[PDB]
């Protein structure tokens, strides 16, 4: 006789269905078949149903608003003449009076979001024609966005969504679906946060490591938010269109005094393209920043040329300027030179040398 199932929980899916889950006992080395008796009690319809499932979860379609769900689960050994376990403690779940599905949406700027609602008036489902939508109880949503998917549920479609401005503490938009002029207290939460984070990578003068820096200016408005840099290393080069890869690696980034997070890759692959993005893991959901692919061999900063000597040619009168090409990069090089009168403020005259094999330039003064 196995122990009764523990951890009986009931949750609401995004599709509007009631998911009942339970945990198998940790002392049974054999699979268990479960019998779940659930009763749905409304003011008009009372139903009882027993279902036998091999899995540890059960789905109930179209959970009714303002109804009480009482669930009991018992278990049995799947193989052989097992003994049925005792019934677990009944779990009671009480619903609200208006259904929004999905209740919350995490989206980005410019996306299209569809919200569906079912409105109940005295345990009666209002037809979709009477349903009127409002934004933050301020203004009525235009009827062009209104769509009737079915006679019981209404929906609204939002196209080319902009960033929701913060109104005080609330950073989301509350969308209300109502029976005509009279509205309900509950709503749907729309979170359009700014995920456009610019990451700039830069290699050292010896091309041994690459430090990538990114700012946190647009993410300070949200508390309890965790930011993690995720990168994927390709075998060769960067693709023309960077994209989020399912297999990615986290990177340890440290905040500096200037408010920028720096992440150091050492060693670095010169001709392997790194597709990087920022993953924000909220309490409900995870968002990814638009990924950017960086090739280290193309981000060559390195140190300006050394051994710069500025002399004046004898009996010629031309300012001869010489230098030494730095170790990196080894591509063809162009040079920019500013020359002026030495003083408290120097009027810099500009010159450009586009010859790669040029090391000394004579200029008139």
């Amino acid at each position: 006789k196995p122990d009764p199932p523990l951890g009986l929980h009931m949750e609401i899916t995004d599709d509007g269905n009631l998911k009942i889950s339970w945990s198998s006992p940790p002392l049974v080395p054999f699979p268990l078949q479960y019998q779940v008796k659930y009763s749905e009690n409304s003011t008009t319809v009372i139903r009882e149903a027993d279902k036998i499932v091999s899995a540890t979860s059960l789905l109930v379609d179209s959970i009714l608003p303002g109804s009480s769900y009482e669930v009991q689960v018992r278990g049995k050994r799947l193989d052989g003449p097992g003994i049925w376990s005792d019934w677990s403690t009944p779990r009671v779940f009480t619903t609200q009076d208006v259904i929004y599905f999905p209740p919350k949406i995490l989206t980005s700027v410019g996306s299209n979001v569809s919200f569906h609602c079912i409105y109940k008036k005295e345990n009666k489902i209002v037809p979709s024609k009477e349903i009127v939508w409002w934004m933050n109880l301020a203004e009525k949503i235009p009827q062009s966005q209104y769509d009737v998917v079915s006679d019981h549920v209404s929906k609204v479609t939002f196209f080319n969504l902009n960033e929701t401005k913060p109104r005080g503490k609330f950073t989301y938009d509350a969308v209300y679906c109502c029976n005509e002029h009279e509205c309900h207290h509950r709503y749907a939460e729309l979170y359009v946060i700014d995920v456009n984070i610019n990451i700039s990578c830069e290699t050292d003068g010896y091309l041994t490591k690459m430090t990538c820096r990114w700012s946190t200016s647009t993410i300070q408005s949200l508390a309890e938010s965790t930011l993690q840099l995720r990168y994927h290393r390709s075998s060769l080069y960067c693709s023309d269109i960077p994209s989020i890869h399912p297999i990615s690696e986290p990177k340890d980034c440290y905040l500096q005094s200037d408010g920028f997070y720096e992440c150091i890759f050492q060693p670095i692959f010169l001709l392997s393209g790194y597709t990087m993005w920022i993953r924000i893991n909220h309490s409900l959901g995870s968002l990814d920043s638009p990924p950017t692919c960086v090739l280290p061999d193309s981000v060559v900063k390195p140190l300006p040329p050394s051994s710069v000597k500025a002399e004046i040619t004898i009996n010629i009168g031309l300012l001869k300027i010489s230098w030494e090409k730095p170790v990196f990069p080894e591509n063809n090089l162009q040079f920019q030179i500013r020359y002026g009168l030495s003083g408290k403020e120097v009027q810099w005259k500009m010159y450009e040398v586009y010859d790669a094999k040029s090391k000394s330039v004579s200029l008139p003064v």
């Binding site: 010896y206 091309l207 041994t208 075998s235 060769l236 050492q266 060693p267 670095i268 692959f269 010169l270 001709l271 392997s272 061999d297 170790v327 990196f328 990069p329 080894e330 591509n331």
Partner: protein, 146 residues
């Protein structure tokens, strides 16, 4: 895949690695061609006529460089990996099938030289690498074949 761009990038990568070795002051003073006994396993200047030979040579160099603890060497190993990949894509553009070279099976001996004399192994390995890269760069215009 543009063949010309890959070839030019390959050239630039070779010069880059050569310059890296140039930065290493102790390697510059050592004769590349000169023979030192015990290091013979390292693929030094011996005619590297073909792409498969180049691939196996680079594979061995990567395998040797991986074992030596040096920050510069790890980057050089990465550049060598990229160089091999470039050679493989070129071999594909030439309709050649290059099998992926394994490194030397015979590393059970390299440990001894690394333990007894690290300095000799490092200077020789670097100078011979630079030499091998230089002849490879010379031959890359001669229309290398498989």
């Amino acid at each position: 895949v543009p063949i010309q761009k890959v070839q030019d990038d390959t050239k630039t990568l070779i010069k880059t690695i050569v310059t890296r070795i140039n930065d290493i002051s102790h390697t510059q003073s050592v004769s590349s061609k000169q023979k030192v006994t015990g290091l013979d396993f390292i693929p030094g200047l011996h005619p590297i006529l073909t792409l498969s030979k180049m691939d196996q040579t680079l594979a061995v160099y990567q395998q040797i460089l991986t074992s030596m603890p040096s920050r510069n060497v790890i980057q050089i190993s990465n550049d060598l990996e990229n160089l091999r990949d470039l050679l493989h894509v070129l071999a594909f553009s030439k309709s050649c099938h290059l099998p992926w070279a394994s490194g030397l099976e015979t590393l059970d001996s390299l440990g001894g030289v690394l333990e007894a004399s690290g300095y000799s192994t490092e200077v020789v390995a670097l100078s011979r690498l630079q030499g091998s890269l230089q002849d490879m760069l010379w031959q890359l215009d001669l229309s290398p074949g498989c």
